[PDB]
Design a binder for this molecule. Structure first.
Ligand code: HEM
Ligand code: HEM
Lengths: 121, 121
């Protein structure tokens, strides 16, 4: 668990409170209602996978390889509407005890969330 | 919109990458699989409401009043399993142009997310 949902909700509440604050400056409740309607039913985690340094999962994956090559997280919206994040996993010094220090990354993490209201897998 | 889902996903990916890192130190993929299984299908925003400084929505709400009185966010797990956050909205100086500066808070924000796999409203 690691209490992820609670931590995610806390982070999300901070984001939402920040946006609500901007909307409140207008002194118009209608704008609040429209923000809420666009947020409801979304955010559910749809998938979480791990890939090796070659872009292969647990043939290589082009987007993952590209992500590994660019050395940056890749954000891709695609279809149900969903959002996918490919995060390269850095071969930190603590990891180097079991992963050759010659590799910048040991693999990548694929996270996908739902942008479809009411859809959670 | 304010691109909330993307910002939430980015924040979530940071949380997940941190946890995955701890699990990777074990060099055991089984533990990764169990974390993923416990995360899937959760996180969907179920509700987002606003309350005034008295605990009334747009009779007063006891938990909201308490939240306003304690001056701190209240985290409450309850039932479908869900997670509710009551965040008091501080009457910042920029808000004081239209809300009497004598009130510490102008109201509160209620955010509820799903802890039920597959449930998104
Ligand atoms: C971050 C700063 C602000 C916060 C936190 C805030 C918060 C709130 C909250 C919680 C409500 C709903 C409950 C209630 O009616 O008391 C509200 C209502 C309202 N606020 Fe603010 N507010 C802020 C800034 C402003 C500003 C700058 C204005 C003036 C331009 C404004 C004008 C009003 C008005 C007129 C309402 C009534 C809405 C209606 O017609 O029902 N607020 N505000
Ligand atoms: C934050 C540090 C670490 C990261 C980012 C990391 C990441 C990864 C990744 C992405 C994989 C799956 C793909 C692959 O097999 O290459 C993996 C596999 C593995 N890692 Fe790590 N690792 C870390 C630390 C460690 C440590 C400290 C050990 C040694 C105690 C370890 C031992 C292994 C082993 C043996 C596997 C094979 C798993 C299997 O049996 O299939 N890793 N690691």
């Amino acid at each position: 668990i690691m209490d992820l949902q609670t931590r995610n909700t806390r982070g999300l509440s901070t984001l939402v409170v920040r946006d609500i604050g901007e909307l409140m400056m207008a002194g118009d409740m209608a704008v609040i209602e429209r923000y809420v309607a666009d947020v409801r039913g979304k955010g559910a985690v749809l998938d979480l996978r791990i890939y090796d340094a070659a872009g292969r999962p647990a043939a290589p994956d082009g987007e993952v390889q590209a992500a590994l090559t660019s050395g940056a997280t890749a954000e891709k919206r695609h279809k149900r509407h969903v959002l996918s994040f490919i995060v390269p996993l850095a071969n930190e010094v603590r990891c180097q005890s079991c992963h050759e220090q010659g590799a910048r990354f040991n693999g990548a993490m694929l996270l996908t969330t739902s942008l479809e209201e009411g859809y959670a897998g």
